[PDB]
Every structure is written in C-alpha cells, then in structure tokens.
Amino acid sequence: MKQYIWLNETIKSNKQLAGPRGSYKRPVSVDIFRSSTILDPDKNYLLIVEEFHLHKIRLPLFKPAGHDYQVGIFNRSTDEIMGVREVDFSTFVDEDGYMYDYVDVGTAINETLAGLCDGIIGEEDIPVFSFNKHSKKFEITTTENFRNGHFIMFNDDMRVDFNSFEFDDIDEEYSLVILNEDVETQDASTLEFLTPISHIVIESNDLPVSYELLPSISKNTTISDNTGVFLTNYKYLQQNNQDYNSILFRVENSSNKYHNILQTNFNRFNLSFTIYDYDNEKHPLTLLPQTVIQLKLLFESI
Amino acid sequence: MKQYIWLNETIKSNKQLAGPRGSYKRPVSVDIFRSSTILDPDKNYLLIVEEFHLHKIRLPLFKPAGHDYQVGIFNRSTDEIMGVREVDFSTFVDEDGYMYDYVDVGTAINETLAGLCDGIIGEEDIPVFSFNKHSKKFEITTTENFRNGHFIMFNDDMRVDFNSFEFDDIDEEYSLVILNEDVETQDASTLEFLTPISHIVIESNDLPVSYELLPSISKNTTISDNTGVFLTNYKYLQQNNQDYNSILFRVENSSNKYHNILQTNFNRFNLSFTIYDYDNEKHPLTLLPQTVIQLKLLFESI
Amino acid sequence: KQYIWLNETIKSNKQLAGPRGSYKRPVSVDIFRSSTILDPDKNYLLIVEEFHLHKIRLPLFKPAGHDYQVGIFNRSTDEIMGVREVDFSTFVDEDGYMYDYVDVGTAINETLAGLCDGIIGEEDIPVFSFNKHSKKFEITTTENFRNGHFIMFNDDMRVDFNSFEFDDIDEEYSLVILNEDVETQDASTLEFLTPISHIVIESNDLPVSYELLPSISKNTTISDNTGVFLTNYKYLQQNNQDYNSILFRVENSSNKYHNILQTNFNRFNLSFTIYDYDNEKHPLTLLPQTVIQLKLLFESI
Amino acid sequence: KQYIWLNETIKSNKQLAGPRGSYKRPVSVDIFRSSTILDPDKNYLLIVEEFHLHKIRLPLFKPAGHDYQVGIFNRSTDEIMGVREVDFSTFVDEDGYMYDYVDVGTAINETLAGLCDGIIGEEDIPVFSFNKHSKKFEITTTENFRNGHFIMFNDDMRVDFNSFEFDDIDEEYSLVILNEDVETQDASTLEFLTPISHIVIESNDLPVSYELLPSISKNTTISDNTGVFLTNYKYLQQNNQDYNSILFRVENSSNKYHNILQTNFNRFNLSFTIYDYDNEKHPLTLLPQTVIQLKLLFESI
Amino acid sequence: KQYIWLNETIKSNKQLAGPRGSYKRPVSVDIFRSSTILDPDKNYLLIVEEFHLHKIRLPLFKPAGHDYQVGIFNRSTDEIMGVREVDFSTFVDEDGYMYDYVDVGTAINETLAGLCDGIIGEEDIPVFSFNKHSKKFEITTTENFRNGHFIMFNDDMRVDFNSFEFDDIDEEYSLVILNEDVETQDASTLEFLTPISHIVIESNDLPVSYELLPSISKNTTISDNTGVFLTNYKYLQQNNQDYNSILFRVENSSNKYHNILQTNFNRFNLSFTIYDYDNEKHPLTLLPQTVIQLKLLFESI
C-alpha cells in the first residue's frame, strides 16, 4: 500500500524577467497548479525534497555590517600605539549591504591601513594587505626596516576572522601580527569565517504542511510560540572566491528531512527559495537572466 | 515473505547496427521479453533501478544556441568602446547543434576577438583567448603594451560562464577583464557553466508504472496535468574535456528512488535512455559501434 | 528477527595452486555443517556482507574484443601511405589476455615501427609508449615528422585512446594532432582498456532465488534464462597493477538481498566467477599466496 | 508517524562573552514554549539532526596529560650527560591549556637549550621547532653535534612525536637518530597532541533515558552511574587552527536515538560540553563572534 | 522500541602497561552493574556503535608467513650465479613481528649484499631500500651492473613487490627489469606486507548468538565450530606508522547486529583481539599512553 508521488518543477529565466545582471531582484518562486488533486484523501503523506539545482545564480561573499574590523600601528622604540582606524567598506558595498569579491575585502583593509600610515610611515615602508587568488589566502607584504621599527595591529574581529596568521596579544582588544618575511601568508584558508551566508531554504506560505518550532521573535523572552514553514534547509559553505555558483542538492541514504502533510485536499501551492545569513537576517534568492532552477519533491504515504 | 525479483539486461553493439562513429544515431533501447509473467498477481511491487553502466558512449560538451556571447575592446586614452561583435559558433557545430571539445569553444572566442582587432590594433598586441588542456581553465595571453592601452570586454553571458576571471563593471551589459600579467588564467574551473547536459533518464512507453507529475507545456498558463514515465534520474556533471565517457551508476545514495507498479500481469516492456539538456530539450542517448550498456532492475514486493 | 552469520576462508599454497597458480584451481568453498543452519519455522533473506580477495591476479587487456589499426598520412601528397592491424599474438597468454599496459603500448609501437620500415627514415620514426608514472600513453616525435606526416588511428583506437586531440579525415580513420616532441593524453583512459566488468559469487546447490537474465540466443529476444548470483562487485582498473587485493564491504543503504526458498539444508557451494564486457565468464583462480575471506548474513523476515 | 522539528540559535556579543571570551560563558540554551511540544498519546525518539558551532576557540595541547623529558647522550664517553622535564608553566592559560603548536615547540626547545648551556657551546645547541607549512616538527643541528652527541626523548615524547626514527638505549629513554642539518617527521602527529576527544550535548531537565556509564572509582568495577547525552561528536585536530567552525549533520549515524520517557513538558536546557582524553569534562564557551545553530527531531513510534 | 546505550573506557598509564608496554596487558574491560541492564520481557539486538583505539602499536610485517629469496643472473653466460633466502632473524621481536618497512628493506638489502660479496665488485653491488617519502621500495644500480647482470626475485617476492617490471625465466624465479640508476615501484604495495587482517571485539560471558565458523582441522570440511564476535573491523596499512590511532563509527543503516539470547545478566567482559591473514589470533595490548573508548547499543525489536 505504500505510495510514491513525484512532482517535478522548473524555472526558466531571461533578460526581460530578471533585468540586466538580475537588477530587478525577482524572487525565485514557483506556482504549482494542477487540474486535479495531487494526493489521495484516504491516505496520510510525508513530504521530502529529493533534489534541487540552483543553476547559475549569484551569492554574496562578505557583509561588512556584521563585522567591526580595526587596524593599527605599534612602535618598537617608544613601545606604544601610534594609531587605530576602523575599516570603512562604505565605497565597496552594493545597495543591499553586500560585497562579491575577497579582492575588494582585501583592498578595503589596505586603504584603511595605507591611510593610517599616511603621516607616520615613509612611502616605501607602507605595508600592503592583499588577497591571493591562487591560494585563497590573505597576505601581508612588508619591508625589513618596517618589521624592525613597527608592528601591524589587528583588533579581535580581525584577529578571529583572519586567524591563521601568527599573533601576540598586547592587551584585551588588540594583537600584533608577527612578521618574519617580506611576504607573509596565512597558514590556512579562512573564507568560511568571512561569508555571511548560512543556509538556503525552501518555504511555502500556503502548503498544508506541519511547521517547524522556532525560538522567540523578540530578543527578550525565552518563552515562544513562534513557528515557520521549512521544506528543506541546505547548509551553504564558501570554498573559494566565486560569487557566481551552481548549487546541486541531492538527498542521501538517511533522508530524515520529512514533514507531515496535514491536508490531503489541495491542487495548488507556492514554493520559494530563501537565504538565511548568520545574523538570522532573511532575504530571497533572486534570478539572473541565465538562471535555470530544477526541483523534485516526493510525497510518500505511510 | 518479502520478495526480491532481479532483472538484468545488456546491449552489445557493432558497426552495422550503429554506423561508423555512431553515424546512424540508433537510440539506446531494449525490449525485455519473457516466457511467463515476471511478477506474482497476489502481491504489490515497487520498482527501483539498482545499477546501470553506459560504457563507451559520446556526449556533447557545449551547445551554442543557448548562449549569447559578445566580446569587445575598450580604449583607456579615449575612454570609449571601440568595437563589439557576437561570437559565431556556426563553423564549429555538428548537425544537432553541439560541440565536443572546449578547445574549440576557446578557438571560436579567439577568432571573434582576432577579427575585431583586425582593423584597430597592431598584430603583435592582439590578445589570445584559449583553453588549457592541463588545468581545465581558460587563459588570456597579452602583451604589456596592450594592457596599458586597452581592455577586453565580456557581456553578461560571457561574464557568468567565465566568472572566475577578475571583472570590473562599466555598463549594464559589458564588464572589463582585469589583466596584470602576460598569461592570466581563471581562479577556478567553470566547465559546469558550459555543459548543456543536465540529466540522463531511463523511460518506458509500456511498463505499467506510476507516472511522475510534470510542469505545464504551454508558455502562457501555469496550470497543468502533464505527466511522464521516469524510472531513474542520473544527474550528469562534466568533470573534464572528455567527450567520450564511461558512466557508472549504483544506488548507494537514492534509497527513496522507488516507483509503484500498477499492474502485475505484464510480460514484456521497453526501456530507453534519454538525455535532458538544461533548456529542457529532450534527445536520445545513441550507440557507438563499441558501446556496451548494462542495466539492473529490482522489483521489491510490499 | 534473527541474524545468522557465517564466516569462510580459503588459505592457499604451492601444492594446492601450483607455481604462479599454474593449476588454475577455481576459488571455491564447500560449507558443510553438522546440523541445519536455518530453523525451519522462519523465512530468510541472504546478503553478502563482505569478502576479501587478497593476493590474486587479474588481466588488464583482451585483444580479441578490439580491432586496432594504425596508419601514416603524407601531408605533401595529401594521401594515405599505409595501414596495418595491431597484432597482439606475440604478447598474449593461453587464455587470451595481457597483464601490463606497457606491453599494450609496446605492441602498438611495433605495429607503428613496422609500417614505417620502408617509408620513413630511422630517426623520425614515432614512438608510442605507456608512462608508468602518469598512467597515460605518450607519443614521442621529431619536428621533421610533424611537418611531413600525421599518425592515423582507426575508430577503435580513437575511442579507447580518446584523450589525445583528433581530426577526422574519413568515416574510419582520424589524424592525431601533434605540436610538441612528447605529447600525452589529457586524461587516463585505462577504464576503456580493462576487460573486467564484474566479479560474482555463485552457487550450484544453495536454495536461493535466481536472477532473471536475457536470452542466450543470437537472434530471438524472448527469454526464460536465469542464474544464481549472491552478489556482484563492479570492478574498475585504477592503475597498472595485475596483482590486486580486492576488498568489498556493504555500505548502509542495503538492497542486495536474495530470497532463500528452502530452510532445510546444511551444505552448499560458493564459487567466485569473473565476467568480462563481452559477457564471457571465467573463474577466479588461486595463487599460492592467496587468502580469501567471506562473510554471509542470513536475516529473517 | 509524526516528525516534530525544533530549531534553536545562540547569537553572541562582547558584553555576553567578554573580550576574547574572557568571561567563560557556557554555551547553553533554555527552550521554553507556551503549549506542550509532544502529543501525550504517542511515544517518541529524540535525535540531534544537526548543529553548527561557528567561530569558537578550542585548545590544541594540555601539558598535565603528558610527562615529556629531553636529554643529551655523549657518543665518546657513552653515558648520559643530563635529563630534564619540559616546563610548560610560562606558556599555559588559567585553565591549563595551550593554543598553538609553535608554542609547544618553543617550550620543548627552551628545556633543550637550558640543559645544554653549561655542557655544549652556543654554535652546536640544537633547535626543536614546529613547521607551520608542513604541520610537522623539526630538529635543526650542526654536523659537529651529530658526531659528538645524541638528543634523548623519553617514552611520552617518543610516542607523541613517533615519525622520527629512534633507538632504545634503556627502558625509558630513546636516541633521536639525525643525519641531515634539518631532520623532520615522516608523518604529522597532531592527532597525538590534541587533548580534545568528544563534544557532547547534555540536558539536566529533559525527560530522556540516560546512557550507562562506568564507576567514577578507579579501583572498583561495579557501577550504577549514568548521564544524559543527546549526541556526541568525535573531534579531530588536523592542523594548527585553534579557531574553528564545526559543522555536524546526521548523514553518518542516524542510529543515535534516545527514548523520551515523559511526553508532558514544555521546558528544557541544552548545553555543549567538551570531554578530553583523560575524561576531564569542561564547558564549550562563547567568543563575542560566536553563532551557534541547533536542530532537534522528535520522531514518533 | 527501546534504545539502551552503554559507554566504556580504559585510561592507561606506566604502572598498568609497563615501560613501552613491557607487561603486554590485554585490552579488556569488565562491565558490572547493580541491577540488570536489559528488560526481561523484551528481546534485543546488540550493535557496536563506535570505538576509538587511541595510541596503540601494531606490527607492519611478519616474516614467518613469507618465504623470500633473491638471486643474481649473468647476461654473458646466461645462467644463475647464486640464490639466497632472506633471513629476518636479526630484525624480529619476541612475538615474530617487525615494525618498520625500512628494516624490511634493510633485511632484503643485506641478503642481496652478502650474495654479491664474492661474485661482484664493491661499486656495482645493487642497493634495495624503502623510500619513506613515497612509501615505495627502490633499487639503486650502476650502468655496468645492468649491462652485466640482473637481480632475481622468487614468486613470493614477485607477488609482494609486484609493482616492479618483471620477466619470468623459470617456474619460481623472475628478472627485475632495470633501465635507470634509481628504479622505483609504479604503485605502493604495503597492503601485501601487513600481516594484520582485522581487529575484533570478543566476549566469554555475554549471552549473544555466536557466528558460525569453518573447521579448525584441515582434514575434514565438516564443522560445528563457533565463536563470539561483536564487531569486525577491517584494517588497512596505508603508511609506515606502527603507532596508530584507530577510529570506528557505524554507518546509519548497518546490518551488523547480533541476537542477545538471555536478558537476565548484569556482568560481562569485552576484549580486543587482532587476527592475521594466516588466521593466528593475538591480543591488542596497552601502551602507557593508550586511551580506549567504546559505545554499545542494545536495541529492542
């Protein structure tokens, strides 16, 4: 008596629908609509998302608002701090608050550093902070008399997010960057610390499916009655410096991500793709002209 | 007594059946035909494709119809667009609309670029777009005098499909390729953005099996009662520059990939292999003279 | 629910297998137990949990399946100078196999050298070899050859050595494009050369459900053909190693079950059989050093 | 069958965690809902589907679990010159931990150089160091030192730094055989240095069946000991990163269920505890930048 | 459906294990609880969910299993000059094992260097060694040795060092084809050298269904032999490390269950045992630094 009902669905795009480079920000959404009912009224069903493919989409790599970076210059002779300046990303950011290239994250940190040294260090001893495309690691390029005279300072947010450099803590907030070579690099990639993207989610405002329990909407009370609809949640990881992506999800062996279907009598519902950031700020996945999206669902009877 | 019924099948080929280099384009198809009935009438069954092997077949690597590429050249001194041309693939394409080598995709982009430099730029400083066999990444080769004078422009389709270059957006369509060295290469492979092949499916016109639910045929309306018989969905990924492949599948992941058998009394049925492109255009998997195809089905009783 | 486990092993020696396995003794075990294995009141499924074929020999190539031909194309006259079949007969064992991809490379080389005996000077004769390091075939050439001529591969050579760069001239032959002294394959193609498809465990006398097979006949489609298979392991040739240690362990998503039809037995045979891509089955044979391990599960329903 | 999902998060900041996580705030969450979570008619299993410990600091070394000693052996006189315990006192935090293998190397070195200063000249004093790039420890020496002397490692040093080649002179000490100026480990041994074994989710108040534990008594065997564990993540230190982002997802082992004993509840606590290899348990703590995510599944039966 | 989890650990030290594990104390634990573990009215399966054997020492080679012989062949005379069997006696520990592939290389090298003593000049003696970096054995030779002579491997050597290029002259012996100074294996063959087959958890007194085993005596094939195995871990030697840290974690949907026959018990013993390819059984033993972890599941039906 076990029944398997498979529902495929797709989304084509174009320049008229999405605008140049996805300027219109059209959310990825699909209206499933059929002439008859999908499920039998005698049976109880579970819903699982078997697969999806988000082919040719754009995702942000950095979100300055979440971070509070600061750089500084220390002196060896006087043994005191020369200055401290916050990293200003304002010129590099798009309207929605995001950046799309770790070269630009590296550039912004460099301009803050070069600007801080303007009065106090000579031109050819100004250290350069940059992002290497090959190794996916940030590097610090320095002269030998700079290393003898001064140190570069990172505050705790810079310390943590660029953790694979070598550090020597001077106080509660600031740390010195230990530099022995002309070109010093990270021991390891830390791009996972910089990406704002946490999860990608499929939701539905009208599908009669059992909600997931959530914590309190407010920041105050532990007590909560809050719920939400989630059909699958895919954990996103940023392996490299590619803002343009092609994301394949295929359910594996265990396939534990089931949700109860509450009402059998329906022929219509909406599905949407939503991106959650690490700060829990929600925003929709948007189409490019060249985006194709595939989706496969399974309604399984019990 | 739960029952496992296993069904094996193979296709050998030759030069008479398939034609030279598979000229005849005979679809991969099998008629399973047996003496007595395959299943018991007293039981209900699920069908799952345990394993297949597409041994020595050919697959296309690129499909120019779906892409609208344009290159261009931007002068720094005048600070204006000098020329723009569409990339023409007509001289590289086979009967069905496909190409079979990423070198040729590189060459086509190169000749477009050379043709656009014909009148305006001197012969020694003409840039060379190419495909590196060793790294699976496309490269742009340039002289120092060219980089001081001019830029290479990619439109939004080029931008997306060759995204791992460093870009600088000048306009709603075109973006500048930032070049700092003689030979500049992609920071990541983008062959996944070029392959027209999405899925490879096994289907049947006469097996009494439950249909999967499909989206609307008509462009205007969203409603649909469209259906189709799909026995398995193999997702394809282009790993390298190999048109000739040996494709193995074993069901270690898709525990859920079952289909209901509606009738128990059948004696014979057809199976055929079909390739779906990303534009959802259907075309059959075809034989070479050297093709061997293996296939294993499971009828599992409930 | 009942889980009944059954271990078996085959130690080998020079007296049982002969020197270099010259006796060709099939890998085979007779299980024989004092009482009945399964209790008569229950119904059972059989599954093969693991085996280990430790220290055995497998072939890497089988010339009979392939029809290789090489040729020389003159670029000046713009015509074919000659064509010859690749003969593997000096390289093959009694059973029809070869055991090293160096030898497969050597045989293609000697065919290519022989065809250039009268036509081209000694110094420009091209060399086709197998690299042990990269598992890729290579073509060594002089610059004088590359201007004058091209090497030709027929379609079987084209498909099996597909990762070279090719240019078709007619419906059978293709030109090998060569721009450097030492040109090599873009990717390994050993998967195209191995004859080994599957390794299987079968039984003459175990009361188990048979798998449905296609027709033995050359012409007709209709079939009542069947056969006993307890597991089938897909084999892939990763490198140039004829000697192998093959480990199989069942992953969690467990489908490879077979119905036991009769509970009343205390004795059965198991045999290991190799299947090739041309469907020709032959037995897995013992070496003196071979150890074989096996674990079966009888799981009740 | 019913699937009840429950998500939770912990945002953090400078005021909650303190500078560099100095306040040592345990990673903990109180769930609290207006209505009851589970239907009283049904029976449930609990499984932790996923968590993500994003931006946390973990120790890389814990001196109290080791007893390291270096020494010097003279080749000519063929006797032990001296021996000393490696002093980690200066390099350690309040809680007894270190966070960099560069500092583990430095501590071993200063003990080695302190033992040499009266009996070996400056030029020939060997340098023990950690290599950031290869993730392997190294010993830098002069040819004059190699011929005159040997470095001595005791058993604990011998085992934790096992990829150097060794020569046992007595039942405790071993000679480090050195041929080049810079000699390195044949393999990384960071897995032997980490104190972190498991990371666990526990709950004092959730009505879930306990896991059976052995006695806290070292001498006696008998035990009635128990504890609430909802999942246990095995941790592996691969590199020199104290700052981590740890992701768990139940693809591997969905056998990890615990019986819910009481359906009637709307409140419980979840905490993240770290267990070292000596079984010393301690709380996972927050940095200002930490974000923690958590997903539980109550599944009916 | 009930899930009963039982944890267990062994925290070693110098006094329990002895210096370098001198005391050869087997890895064994006694579970002993106040009340009965399982419910009397229910029926149970047992699965081992995970273990961790952290800081143990395993052997890499076992000479008694192999009969290695090298030889030398003259090109000019076209005959065998000499043959000698490879003696490992001077390298082997009390229990018949060796712990470094360098020493296996050295032992073959001395057997080779003793055979050349009277026959070949000092410079032209070939060197057999193990390359630590590549995990491959190597042969170093001079130009005039390759022109003058060949090295011979017998069939046992041929099979265990199969990655070299070979050429057979006789039912037992084969020639090692050497074209360059330093010649190496085309593939690693440490898997042909490890004597370790699997690591097993046993129990004398746990009331659990035994696994069915073959005959102890090789005379007859009939057998009523049985043995208690709770889990069965296949071991693979991937490098030259004798000191290891072995982690086992079960797959989501494993079949590796055993039937518990009696629910009325509160005590049992677990022990870790190593099985070799010759089926010889020996206990896993503690070092002072060893930590053992273990998690059982009893799952009701």
Map residue B96 onto helix, strand or coil.
coil
Beta bridge partners of D127: D140
Nearest to A10 among B255, B259, B280 (CB): B280
CA distances from E44 to E2, E38, E244, E259, E264 (A): 9, 8, 34, 6, 12
Dist. CA B209–CA B260, nearest whole Å: 6
Dist. CA B218–CA B223, nearest whole Å: 9
- Which residues of E fall within a CB distance of 8 Å from C47? 255
Give residues with Cβ within 8 angstroms of B281, minimum separation 6. Answer: none
- CB–CB contact E162 C54 (8 Å): no
CB atoms within 10 A of CB D84: 14
Map residue D102 onto helix, strand or coil.
helix
E211 and chain C in contact, CB less than 8 A: yes
Side-chain half-sphere exposure of B136, counting CA atoms within 13 A: 15
Backbone φ, ψ for residue E132 (5° rounding): -55, -40
Map residue E223 onto helix, strand or coil.
strand
SS3 content of chain B, % helix, strand, coil (to 5): 15, 40, 45
Comparing alpha-carbon positions, the chain A residue that sits nearest to C254 is: A253
- Which residues of A fall within a CB distance of 8 Å from D58? none
Question: At which residue do the structure tokens 């005048």 appear?
Answer: B78
Pick from A191, A253, A254 the residue to mutate for testing the D interface (most D CBs within 10 Å): A254
Subunits adjacent to chain E (3 or more Cβ pairs under 8 Å): A, C, D
Backbone φ, ψ for residue C176 (5° rounding): -85, 110
Structure tokens that stand for C158 in this block: 């084209």
Dist. CA E137–CA E106, nearest whole Å: 11
CB < 8 Å from E in window 130-149 of C: 132-133
Residue ranges of domains in chain A: 1-61+195-302, 62-194
Give one DSSP letter per residue of E180-206, joined into a string: SSEEE-SS--GGGT--EEEEEEE-SS-
Beta bridge partners of D59: none
Dihedral angle computed from the Cα positions of residues D195, D197, D201 and D203, in that order, rounded to the nearest 10 degrees:
-70
Backbone φ, ψ for residue B190 (5° rounding): -125, 25
Dist. CA B130–CA B106, nearest whole Å: 5
B163 and chain A in contact, CB less than 8 A: yes
Query: Closest by alpha carbon to D98, among D68, D70, D78?
Result: D68
List strands edge to edge, sheet with C182-184.
C127-130, C137-140, C182-184
Query: Closest by alpha carbon to E257, among B300, C300, A255?
Result: C300
DSSP state for residue A96 in the 8-state scheme: T
- CB–CB contact D245 A280 (8 Å): no
B243 and chain C in contact, CB less than 8 A: yes
Pick from A217, A223, A232 the residue to mutate for testing the D interface (most D CBs within 10 Å): A223
Beta bridge partners of D10: D292
B189 and chain A in contact, CB less than 8 A: no
Beta bridge partners of D47: D297
A256 and chain E in contact, CB less than 8 A: no
Q: How far is CA E9 from the centre of its chain?
A: 25
| Burial class, C129, CB count within 10 angstroms (exposed 0-12 / middle 13-18 / buried 19+) | middle
Give residues with Cβ within 8 angstroms of C204, minimum separation 6. Answer: C228, C269, C271
Structure tokens that stand for E168 in this block: 């057979």
DSSP state for residue A30 in the 8-state scheme: E
Dist. CA C46–CA C207, nearest whole Å: 10
- Which residues of D fall within a CB distance of 8 Å from A46? 1, 3
C15 and chain B in contact, CB less than 8 A: no
Do the Cβ atoms of D88 and D63 come closer than 8 Å? yes
Give residues with Cβ within 8 angstroms of B28, minimum separation 6. Answer: B11, B54, B272, B273, B284, B285, B286, B287, B291, B293
Dist. CA A224–CA D30, nearest whole Å: 11
Length of chain C (residues): 301
Nearest to D224 among E7, E34, E54 (CB): E34
Give residues with Cβ within 8 angstroms of B171, minimum separation 6. Answer: none
Dist. CA A166–CA A147, nearest whole Å: 14
CB < 8 Å from D in window 41-80 of A: 46
DSSP state for residue D11 in the 8-state scheme: E
Residue C96, sorted as left (phi over 0), alpha (psi -120 to 50) or beta, turns out to be: left
Dist. CA B41–CA D108, nearest whole Å: 77
State the distance between the two ends of chain A, measured CA to CA, in whole angstroms. 8
E253 and chain A in contact, CB less than 8 A: yes
**What's the CA angle centered on D63, arms D58 and D64, to 5 degrees?**
110
Dist. CA C273–CA C200, nearest whole Å: 5
Side chain identity, residue E277: Y
B168 and chain A in contact, CB less than 8 A: no
Residue B111, sorted as left (phi over 0), alpha (psi -120 to 50) or beta, turns out to be: alpha
CA distances from C187 to B134, B191, C104, C136 (A): 9, 16, 17, 7
Method: X-ray
Map residue C108 onto helix, strand or coil.
helix
Structure tokens that stand for A68 in this block: 């509070």
CB atoms within 10 A of CB B145: 12
Dist. CA C86–CA C104, nearest whole Å: 10
- CB–CB contact E7 D214 (8 Å): yes
Dist. CA D233–CA D53, nearest whole Å: 11
CB < 8 Å from C in window 213-232 of B: none
Give one DSSP letter per residue of E57-126, joined into a string: E--SB-GGG---EEEEEETTTTEEEEEEE---TTT--TTS-B--HHHHHHHHHHHHHHHSTTTS-GGG--
Give one DSSP letter per residue of E230-267, joined into a string: SEEEE----SS-SEEEEEEE--TT----EEB-----SE
Do the Cβ atoms of B82 and B75 come closer than 8 Å? yes
Subunits adjacent to chain B (3 or more Cβ pairs under 8 Å): A, C
Largest CA distance in chain B: 84
Structure tokens that stand for E169 in this block: 């002259």
- Which residues of C fall within a CB distance of 8 Å from E277? 54, 291
Do the Cβ atoms of E100 and E240 come closer than 8 Å? yes
C255 and chain A in contact, CB less than 8 A: no
B258 and chain A in contact, CB less than 8 A: yes
D near E: at least 3 beta-carbon pairs less than 8 Å apart: yes
SS3 content of chain D, % helix, strand, coil (to 5): 15, 40, 45
Subunits adjacent to chain D (3 or more Cβ pairs under 8 Å): A, E
Beta strands in B17-107 (DSSP E): 29-33, 45-58, 70-75, 80-86
Q: Helices (H) and strands (E) in chain B — how many of each? A: 4, 20
Do the Cβ atoms of C273 and C281 come closer than 8 Å? yes
Dist. CA D90–CA A165, nearest whole Å: 22
Overall resolution, Å:
2.7
Give residues with Cβ within 8 angstroms of B119, minimum separation 6. Answer: none
B near D: at least 3 beta-carbon pairs less than 8 Å apart: no
What is the least distance, in Å, from the CA of D115 to any CA of chain A?
A: 27
Comparing alpha-carbon positions, the chain C residue that sits nearest to A252 is: C253
Q: How far is CA C162 from the centre of its chain?
A: 19
Query: Closest by alpha carbon to C163, among B61, B138, B242?
Result: B242
- CB–CB contact B258 A3 (8 Å): no
- Which residues of E fall within a CB distance of 8 Å from C35? 224
Task: Compute the radius of gyration of chain A from its Cα atoms.
Answer: 25
Query: Closest by alpha carbon to B206, among B274, B268, B260?
Result: B268
Give residues with Cβ within 8 angstroms of B97, minimum separation 6. Answer: B63, B64, B65
Dist. CA B100–CA B107, nearest whole Å: 13
Q: H or E segment at B265?
A: none
Side chain identity, residue A56: K
Nearest to E259 among C3, C20, C31 (CB): C3
B244 and chain A in contact, CB less than 8 A: no
Do the Cβ atoms of A277 and A198 come closer than 8 Å? yes
Query: Closest by alpha carbon to D83, among D141, D151, D183, D138?
Result: D151
H-state helical runs in A186-274: 191-194
Dist. CA B200–CA B235, nearest whole Å: 6
C near B: at least 3 beta-carbon pairs less than 8 Å apart: yes
Residue-wise burial string across C220-248, b where 16 or more C-beta atoms lie within 10 A, e elsewhere: eeebebeebbbbbeebebebbbbbbbbeb
Dist. CA A295–CA A202, nearest whole Å: 10
What is the least distance, in Å, from the CA of E252 to any CA of chain A?
A: 7
Subunits adjacent to chain C (3 or more Cβ pairs under 8 Å): A, B, E
Question: At which residue do the structure tokens 């060759």 appear?
Answer: B162
Residue-wise burial string across E48-64, b where 16 or more C-beta atoms lie within 10 A, e elsewhere: bbbbbbbbbbbbbbbbe
- CB–CB contact E222 C49 (8 Å): no
